């Protein structure tokens, strides 16, 4: 839940002006305090200056190895119960 969905990073030249122009977030600090949440339809197109960058901060696998541990513990459980 924390990290499965990717997080979009924007290396903007001026974050405050970008927020004010795009999302109308005049006071971004208070927007953070209030817990406000930007709305995106999903279909977006990015017009950036030469120096600005945009990328997705994405994990190879948020679970890591937990499925393997779950398989091992499931084997241990069915062994302990001697359940066919």
């Amino acid at each position: 839940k924390m990290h499965s969905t990717p997080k979009l990073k924007l290396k903007l030249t001026d974050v405050a002006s970008f927020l004010a122009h795009n999302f109308g977030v005049e006071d971004p600090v208070k927007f953070a305090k209030e817990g406000g949440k930007i709305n995106l339809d999903g279909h977006e197109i990015l017009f950036l200056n030469k120096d600005e960058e945009a990328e997705f901060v994405e994990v190879k696998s948020a679970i890591g190895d937990a499925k393997e541990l779950l398989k091992l513990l499931f084997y241990c459980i069915v062994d302990v119960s001697e359940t066919p």
């Binding site: 924007l10 903007l12 030249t13 001026d14 002006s17 970008f18 122009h21 795009n22 339809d41 279909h43 977006e44 197109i45 990015l46 017009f47 950036l48 200056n49 600005e52």
Partner: protein, 103 residues
């Protein structure tokens, strides 16, 4: 008054006001006209100061700034006004929605 502010941006008593009106008309942004006027004023140093940057006569000795330095400074002023024109007219980045009709 636009003309007075331009004369402040590009010093007075050198050009007559007709070319000032011309510069104002050729660019609505006053700083763009100021940059243009500063370049055109830089052109005039070949007459007002000339090449003879230093001379001694009798016991008099005067060392004026060379023409290259003067035109360089005028160009720098024009560049500053041009950058001002850009920044005034510049707008930050934008992320906008996109959508195509479909059935």
């Amino acid at each position: 008054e636009k003309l007075r502010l331009l004369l402040n941006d590009k010093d007075k008593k050198s050009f007559t006001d007709e070319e000032l009106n011309l510069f104002l008309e050729e660019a609505d942004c006053i700083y763009c006209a100021a940059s243009q006027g500063w370049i055109l004023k830089s052109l005039q140093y070949e007459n007002t100061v000339g090449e003879m940057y230093e001379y001694k006569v009798g016991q008099e000795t005067y060392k004026s700034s060379s023409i290259k330095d003067l035109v360089s400074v005028a160009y720098q002023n024009a560049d500053k006004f041009k950058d001002m024109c850009t920044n005034k007219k510049e707008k930050g980045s934008f992320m906008l929605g996109i959508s195509t009709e479909f059935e």
